[PDB]
């Protein structure tokens, strides 16, 4: 009797928030009920409702970097349409694609994609063969998504690792660090 909304598409995805989009059926409806929750969510899914004129809903207060289950229900008062469920993953707090685009005997070029949250700066550590602990680190004023690494001993195994710091002062927290191995 009633067509269920579809054309489901996700975008405007944020770490703790992300937008969901769906098309509106061609039959008279009173609005859609939005229910969303993660697979590991509590047996009590969240309840979000949106007006019929709204086909996109922005979710917030969500765990960054997680697969969320979102369901859309079309209702026309006493009649209900077939449920619609899709899965969307919230971006990850840690940047990504930490790799080298250029390689020099004593230096290397690092490039990575900025996360989905504002970052004050990123911390990058230098990995020297046995310098497992005596690593050398430098900060990254989020000025560029790529940086250059210099002061590296040639012919020596190296490890490049970096930590991203967004909140600072009241709640200085860092995301899980990402590291890679590099031979010099």
Curated annotation (Swiss-Prot):
Post-translational modification remark: Sulfated.
Disruption phenotype: Muscle-specific mutant mice show comparable body weight, glucose tolerance test (GTT) and insulin tolerance test (ITT) with control mice. After high fat diet (HFD) feeding and exercise training, control and mutant mice have a similar body weight and liver and muscle tissue weight but daily exercise training improves GTT and ITT values in HFD-fed control mice but not in HFD-fed mutants.
Tissue: Expressed in the inner limiting membrane and around blood vessels in the retina (at protein level). Plasma FN (soluble dimeric form) is secreted by hepatocytes. Cellular FN (dimeric or cross-linked multimeric forms), made by fibroblasts, epithelial and other cell types, is deposited as fibrils in the extracellular matrix.
Superkingdom of the organism of origin: Eukaryota
Cellular compartment(s): Secreted, Extracellular space, Extracellular matrix; Secreted
Segments of this protein annotated with the region Cell-attachment: 1-184
Motif Cell attachment site: positions: 168-170
Residue span, Fibronectin type-III domain: 6-93, 94-184
Induction: Glucocorticoids suppressed mRNA expression and protein synthesis.
Subunit structure: Mostly heterodimers or multimers of alternatively spliced variants, connected by 2 disulfide bonds near the carboxyl ends; to a lesser extent homodimers. Interacts with FBLN1, AMBP, TNR, LGALS3BP and COL13A1. Interacts with FBLN7. Interacts with COMP. Interacts (via type III repeats 9-14) with TNFAIP6 (via CUB domain); this interaction enhances fibronectin fibril assembly. TNFAIP6 may act as a bridging molecule between FN1 and THBS1. Interacts with TNR; the interaction inhibits cell adhesion and neurite outgrowth. Interacts with FST3 and MYOC. Interacts with SVEP1.
Function per UniProt: Fibronectins bind cell surfaces and various compounds including collagen, fibrin, heparin, DNA, and actin. Fibronectins are involved in cell adhesion, cell motility, opsonization, wound healing, and maintenance of cell shape healing, and maintenance of cell shape. Involved in osteoblast compaction through the fibronectin fibrillogenesis cell-mediated matrix assembly process, essential for osteoblast mineralization. Participates in the regulation of type I collagen deposition by osteoblasts. Acts as a ligand for the Lilrb4a receptor, inhibiting Fcgr1/CD64-mediated monocyte activation.
Name of protein: Fibronectin
Source organism phylogeny: Eukaryota, Metazoa, Chordata, Craniata, Vertebrata
Gene coding for it: Fn1
């Amino acid at each position: 009797g009633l067509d269920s909304p579809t054309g489901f598409d996700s975008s405007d995805i944020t770490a703790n928030s992300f937008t969901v989009h769906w098309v509106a059926p061609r039959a008279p409806i009173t609005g859609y009920i939005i229910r969303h929750h993660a697979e590991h969510s509590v047996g009590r899914p969240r309840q979000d409702r949106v007006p019929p004129s709204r086909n996109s809903i922005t979710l917030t207060n969500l765990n960054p970097g997680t697969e969320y289950v979102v369901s859309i229900i079309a209702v026309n008062g006493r009649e209900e349409s077939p449920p619609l469920i899709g899965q969307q993953a919230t971006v990850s707090d840690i940047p990504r694609d930490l790799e080298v685009i250029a390689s020099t005997p004593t230096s290397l070029l690092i490039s990575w994609e900025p996360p989905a949250v504002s970052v004050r700066y990123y911390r990058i550590t230098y990995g020297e063969t046995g310098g497992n602990s005596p690593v050398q680190e430098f900060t990254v004023p989020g000025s560029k998504s790529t940086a250059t690494i210099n002061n590296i001993k040639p012919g020596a195994d190296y490890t490049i690792t970096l930590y991203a710091v967004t909140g600072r002062g009241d709640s200085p927290a860092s995301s899980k660090p990402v590291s890679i191995n590099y031979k010099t």
